[PDB]
Amino acid sequence: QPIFLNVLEAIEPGVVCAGHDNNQPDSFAALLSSLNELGERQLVHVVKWAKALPGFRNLHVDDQMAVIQYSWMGLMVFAMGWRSFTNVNSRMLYFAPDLVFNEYRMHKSRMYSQCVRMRHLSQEFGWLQITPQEFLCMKALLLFSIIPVDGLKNQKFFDELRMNYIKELDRIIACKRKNPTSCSRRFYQLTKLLDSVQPIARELHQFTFDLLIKSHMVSVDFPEMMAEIISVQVPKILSGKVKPIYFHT
């Protein structure tokens, strides 16, 4: 209740494994290769999930693939933080059931700092007392939070679509909340949270980019679709062509 919420919960992707071999020692090459595999795998669900979103088919076919290729990073990270929260209380990064990052692994991955921000983000879900309804609505809104500076194929359908999801976030906050002060307060809290995701995804973008460039030397494997999206789409973000949409300055 209402119809919007039923869809989000029903289309919510299921558990996904990275197929990591926890029988081998934690090496940079191994860990990163598994993450990319998880990325490729998680990419398949994100696409199916996206197309199953209410009104997603209102966007031009090109912008549909576009928004996905630009925000797939923010979506996966945001979802991961939630899992980590609803699994190990944010104690560790729960990327996948067969790929959990502890203090040690965070270091071995050569991206300790970035993992800290992710864990921090994961702790936000708890401190702010985020609910499943709010989580689902915020995650969907992340798909519509990054586009090229010059706009999309048909920007009108996107603005209207993005606006409607923001409206849903209101009805969610409004519903079951008898107070006009905590309402705006809540919107402020969440909108702030959604913004914190962008800076994090930005560092992961640059990190994955560099890794790809020097992937053969550090012996890190990049799946087909991962290698193309990171070498064709990501570059547009790090070049200033595609920038995220912030609520606050």
Ligand X SMILES: C[C@]12CCC(=O)C[C@@H]1CC[C@@H]1[C@@H]2CC[C@]2(C)[C@@H](O)CC[C@@H]12
**Known binding-site residue numbers for 17beta-hydroxy-5alpha-androstan-3-one:** 36, 83, 208
51 lines the binding site for ligand RB1 (CB under 6 A): yes
For residue 172, the Cα-to-chain-centroid distance in whole angstroms is 21
Residue 38 CA neighbour count, 13 Å, CB half? 24
For residue 94, the Cα-to-chain-centroid distance in whole angstroms is 14
Binder of ligand X out of 76, 147, 169, 234 (CB under 6 A): 76
Tell me which of ligand X, ligand RB1, none is bound by residue 69, counting a contact when its beta carbon lies within the kind-specific cut-off of 5 to 8 angstroms: ligand RB1
Residue whose CB is less far from ligand RB1, 229 or 237? 229
Q: How far apart are CA 146 and CA 201, in angstroms?
A: 11
Alpha helices in 109-213 (DSSP H): 112-127, 132-142, 155-174, 180-213
Question: Measuring CA to CA, which residue among 49, 82, 53, 101 is closest to residue 193?
Answer: 82
68 lines the binding site for ligand RB1 (CB under 6 A): yes
Tell me which residues in 91-120 interact with ligand X (CB under 6 A).
95
47 lines the binding site for ligand RB1 (CB under 6 A): yes
Count of residues in contact with ligand RB1, rule CB under 6 A? 11
Tell me which residues in 119-148 interact with ligand X (CB under 6 A).
none
Residue whose CB is less far from ligand RB1, 64 or 90? 64
74 lines the binding site for ligand X (CB under 6 A): no
Cβ count within 10 A of residue 149: 9
CB of 4 to ligand RB1, least distance (A): 22
Tell me which residues in 220-249 interact with ligand RB1 (CB under 6 A).
225, 229
Tell me which of ligand X, ligand RB1, none is bound by residue 247, counting a contact when its beta carbon lies within the kind-specific cut-off of 5 to 8 angstroms: none
Q: How far apart are CA 139 and CA 42, in angstroms?
A: 14
Q: Is 241 helix (H, G, I), strand (E, B) or coil?
A: coil
Peptide bond into 2 cis (omega under 30): yes
Q: How far apart are CA 157 and CA 76, in angstroms?
A: 24
Q: How far apart are CA 38 and CA 23, in angstroms?
A: 18
CB of 67 to ligand X, least distance (A): 16
Binding site for ligand X (CB under 6 A): 32, 35-36, 38-39, 42, 73, 76-77, 80, 95, 204, 207-208, 211
Binding site for ligand RB1 (CB under 6 A): 43-44, 47, 51, 61, 64-65, 68-69, 225, 229
